[model samples]
Target: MDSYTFPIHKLKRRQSQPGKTPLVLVACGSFSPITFLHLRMFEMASDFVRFNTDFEVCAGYLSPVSDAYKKAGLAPGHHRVNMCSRAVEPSPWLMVDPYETLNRNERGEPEYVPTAKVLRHFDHEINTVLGGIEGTDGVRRKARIALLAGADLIMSMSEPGLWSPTDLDVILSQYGAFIIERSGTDIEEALASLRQYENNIWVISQVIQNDISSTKVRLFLRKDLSVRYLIPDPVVDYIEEHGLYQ
Candidate 1:
């Protein structure tokens, strides 16, 4: 007797409606050296999206600031963009967008692009990725964009002169933030103060404490110590190959 063979491999995955209200998290930062904690923000936000919210996360991005952001020890935009790309190469969900890194003002000098505008670009890009003519077979959902940031940045919103008041309103109202807990900041105070937009604003604490920063990483490198496990291996390799922070 011959055994009957089945073509089970031809079966398709059980598909569901692409989430109606999708969320895209766009993180705009200097990213001098992308640390583990920086990468962990997406993971933490992903966890929150999975268990705590109705919104499905479509994608997350890292938008590096332009070179015009003249802060101490700030690496140039090209290096920062390349480093960020290499750092997130191992991640499945995150990507690095270099538009912000290359943006220039009317005088052809790199200018500080607002975070809200960076998010707008992500929103448009994500819309292109999701919204397309499927010819009535199906429809794709456009993602709602959010700024994924730390507790310190969120708390800084409460500080006068740190952020332009108009920009802060646009940031909170147009694109709300998902703030992760960080050391040395009053997150609750910041949340309570933004009473009207409190519902849109979300806060999360890490399952474990991770108080790492690029400043600390640079300090370690300056001391000739290995920061191998502090950041991704590709980034570590890039830093050594380029002799950064030495």
Candidate 2:
């Protein structure tokens, strides 16, 4: 669809708190078939922002990584984008952005865009192009863009050569991150390695642990087992109709 445009349908146009910083949380991942845990992360981060920080969440987005990522069992970019859209359809403030998944090279094949560039794209779209959100005091302010990811993602940053330090600075220092604590990840230890960006990273602990992952759902689908409560009903229907992951 050449007519595809940046999605601002769910973006909060008016800021709720005059003095609070307007924030937009973007989660970049492979949503081969978006699961309940993927949706829950946004809610968890929103709750944390509401209660623990001076940042008011204006919107949240799920940026599905392109097929160029080449992970095992990854679906096509279009399908993943559709699944993400369906997953966030009922949420008031959540949205799906195809910018990352829609990237193409000279031959029109999917291109791999880095996480830092993806965050920069959001900054340009929301702040530079849209002029951000308006405050209660009738003044528009630049919306703070931040990455919303799981603790495992943060932990990966600690491994040598896993992520470049320049990219880390761009993602953490320039844009910030809200990491949801997942089971088995030593979040405190991971944070220790990224102490320089401590002020920008917000670690949100899960009240009720949920370990559902897309990999497990794909495995269940391959086995022809029920994944009823693991993911959304609409997503399940779409996966069945398309005969995906079988």
lDDT of each: 0.75, 0.89
Alpha-carbon RMSD to native, per candidate: 9.5, 1.3
- Local error of candidate 2 at 73, Å? 1.6
Counting clashing residue pairs in each candidate, in order, gives 0, 0
Residue 82 of model 2, lDDT score: 89
- Model 1, C-alpha of 204: deviation from truth (Å): 1.0
How well does candidate 1 score on lDDT at residue 4? 23
lDDT of each residue in 184-207, candidate 1, tens digit only: 545686678665653678887776
Off by over 4 Å in 2: 183-185
Cα lDDT of model 2 by residue, 1-246, tens digit: 586699999899798786799999999889888999989999999999999998999999999998898999899889988888887898899999999888999999999999999999999999999988899999999989999998767888999986889998878888998989876556887798786864798888887978889989999999989999999998998998899997
TM-score against native, each model: 0.85, 0.96
Ten contiguous residues with the weakest lDDT in model 2? 181-190
| Top of the candidates by TM-score | 2
- Report how far residue 113 has shifted in candidate 1, in Å: 0.1
Error of model 2, residue 181, in angstroms: 0.9
